[PDB]
Design a binder for this molecule. Structure first.
Ligand SMILES: CC(=O)CC(=O)SCCNC(=O)CCNC(=O)[C@H](O)C(C)(C)COP(=O)(O)OP(=O)(O)OC[C@H]1O[C@@H](n2cnc3c(N)ncnc32)[C@H](O)[C@@H]1OP(=O)(O)O
Ligand SMILES: CC(=O)CC(=O)SCCNC(=O)CCNC(=O)[C@H](O)C(C)(C)COP(=O)(O)OP(=O)(O)OC[C@H]1O[C@@H](n2cnc3c(N)ncnc32)[C@H](O)[C@@H]1OP(=O)(O)O
Ligand SMILES: NC(=O)c1ccc[n+]([C@@H]2O[C@H](COP(=O)([O-])OP(=O)(O)OC[C@H]3O[C@@H](n4cnc5c(N)ncnc54)[C@H](O)[C@@H]3O)[C@@H](O)[C@H]2O)c1
Ligand SMILES: NC(=O)c1ccc[n+]([C@@H]2O[C@H](COP(=O)([O-])OP(=O)(O)OC[C@H]3O[C@@H](n4cnc5c(N)ncnc54)[C@H](O)[C@@H]3O)[C@@H](O)[C@H]2O)c1
Lengths: 291, 291
């Protein structure tokens, strides 16, 4: 029954940075890891811009206590370009790297041999089998799924995924952590896409196909879903927000797992934007352009 | 270009009642039609109850203004059990009856006989091809789709659908009418489900399949979609809200136009609830139980 205090987050992208932010904002020590020192600097800078907003809401009439919160949270976030030299002693490792099974497995097979025994390994994957990633180590009882939602500082949901090997103890800890993070945990079975993604991704593709079919423009499709279904964002806005590259990897993943399923049929327009390095908000341009 | 002023709304259910309510609230002469006098009585009663919730808000600080808004609106709504007696002097007929092609054409074939020459016909259908419905008359140039969203008094979207035969003059009148209702009209191609239904319904079916499979529960699936995607309602809360009968009808229609399509595969759980007459909130029970 380990209490999570020291957290290691691998990947300082859209999800990783946010996870680190929230983890730090709620009094946990965090070590954010990524490829280069430039990347980290960018992630850390992003986490700050995100904290300024969270600032106006918790400390509006208090500018002094405003900076305090921001400085302290950034301070509780250490950075490193070497995972192995950080996970030697950590309470939990939350992986948030490229959506690719092979790459994730290699990373965990490696860290498994460095991290202390009590350490717990968690994948924030959107569409992969926790069991498949977990069986890349010899710590499956301490391996599980811990899925966050973009933007991590806003979305309250966290899907805690147990594999048939995950221990109750591992589970409970991750549950407590989720609540310590001020999030709402929901235990899910280890099925592709879990809940939210299994239902949101297929829907996002369809909206693309409706566009590819020639029946409507992206703008009207977005307007329609927001004013008609009350959705926060149109399906194309959301795609761009989440990242076209990430969406593609998810879909290509499910496609291999079952090519006959017409619901995993990859999109030409999506693949073309990715091949042109237009991943949405990330690169400054996806279906839409951003300044 | 006719200026829609008098509107005959056929169907005093979830949509019709709302369509007549909004039209009334916006200074349009309305006639609400339904099968029996009792049914119309409950409808009118519902619109009144709905009008006050709106009063309590939109006029919270002015009771008189609220009272007058309620009375004045209910006052513009007349009831008749036979639309054929009313259409000869109406500007627009917005049909909002059971989702059934046969039964919709029947109604329109009849009305086409009694309606004034300038009268525009509009179906609020969610899944059927307007061209089909329109071909039961010889008024195709004055026939079109005007799709609203539940609940009508809140949702701002209105899909205005032209068939290849709809006249520009007819289209503009509907757009002007949509705007007069305080809505945001979106011109859509006459294709199954237009925009929103075409994207939303298949998703709702997937949420159902996720459940029948045993992967998760309805409650967690709803929590998951709300907290993770920001949706106003979980899929099951929404199915019950919309009506399981209507939903089932929507899917069966599509399932027959493309039996193999996995998107429109019928649901055992949904069919069984419909058969047991549990259509959702309107019947006091659907996937969930209400008061
Ligand atoms: C295939 C097809 O069939 C096509 C379709 O139409 S698909 C269905 C489309 N509609 C949707 O997807 C529904 C999604 N849900 C929603 O957007 C929202 O939950 C909602 C519009 C129903 C409102 O929910 P809500 O915000 O929680 O309101 P609720 O808490 O229910 O009621 C309180 C407020 O809502 C309003 N309200 C809710 N239902 C209302 C109604 N029937 N009439 C008038 N007002 C209503 C009140 O005026 C009230 O005002 P305040 O905010 O100032 O307090
Ligand atoms: C791929 C997978 O496997 C799983 C995934 O994650 S799927 C994607 C999951 N996420 C969603 O579905 C995205 C849907 N979109 C949303 O829910 C909403 O658009 C949203 C939460 C981003 C808010 O957007 P919005 O409605 O346009 O409002 P916005 O003005 O942008 O923000 C609203 C509030 O949140 C804050 N905010 C938004 N983004 C923020 C961030 N990155 N950090 C901290 N605060 C933020 C704002 O300061 C604002 O606060 P106030 O209202 O008090 O002033
Ligand atoms: N985009 C979303 O909204 C969203 C939400 C939930 C989960 N996910 C999932 O979370 C993961 C994170 O996606 P993301 O949006 O943050 O993508 P991202 O591209 O923004 O972030 C990934 C980060 O991984 C880093 N990285 C790659 N290989 C690495 C390695 N070996 N060691 C350290 N860092 C490495 C990259 O430099 C990058 O900064 C994916 O598996 C995705 O399916 C995405
Ligand atoms: N349920 C929704 O939320 C929703 C949203 C948008 C559009 N729609 C579409 O709008 C239509 C309206 O559905 P609804 O939710 O109001 O259903 P409903 O079951 O609540 O209302 C239907 C009404 O039609 C009446 N009716 C049935 N046959 C009739 C006939 N021959 N002549 C006159 N009246 C008749 C019934 O007495 C009832 O009051 C359907 O075509 C549906 O596809 C439904």
């Amino acid at each position: 029954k380990i209490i999570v205090k020291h957290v290691t987050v691998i990947g300082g992208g859209l999800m990783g940075a946010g996870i680190a932010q929230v983890a730090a904002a709620t009094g946990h020590t965090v070590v954010l890891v990524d490829q280069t020192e430039d990347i980290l600097a960018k992630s850390k800078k992003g986490i700050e811009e995100s904290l300024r907003k969270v600032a106006k809401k918790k400390f509006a009439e208090n500018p002094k206590a405003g900076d305090e919160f921001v400085e302290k949270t950034l301070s509780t976030i250490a950075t490193s370009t070497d995972a192995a030299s950080v996970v030697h002693s950590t309470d939990l490792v939350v992986e948030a790297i490229v959506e690719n099974l092979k790459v994730k497995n290699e990373l965990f097979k490696r860290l498994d041999k460095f991290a202390a025994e009590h350490t717990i390994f968690a994948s924030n994957t959107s569409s992969l089998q926790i069991t498949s990633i977990a069986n890349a180590t010899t710590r499956q009882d301490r391996f599980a799924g811990l899925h966050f939602f973009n933007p991590v500082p806003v979305m309250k949901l966290v899907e805690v995924i147990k594999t048939p090997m995950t221990s109750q103890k591992t589970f409970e800890s991750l549950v407590d952590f989720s609540k310590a993070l001020g999030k709402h945990p929901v235990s899910c079975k280890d099925t592709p896409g879990f809940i939210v993604s299994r239902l949101l991704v297929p829907y996002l593709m369809e909206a693309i196909r409706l566009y590819e079919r020639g029946d409507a423009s992206k703008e009207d499709i977005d307007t329609a879903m927001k004013l008609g279904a009350g959705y926060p964002m149109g399906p194309f806005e959301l795609l761009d927000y989440v990242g076209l590259d990430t969406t593609k990897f998810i879909v290509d993943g499910w496609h291999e797992m079952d090519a006959e399923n017409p619901l995993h049929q990859p999109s030409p327009s999506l693949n073309k934007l990715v091949a042109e390095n237009k991943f949405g908000k990330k690169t400054g341009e996806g279906f839409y352009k951003y300044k």
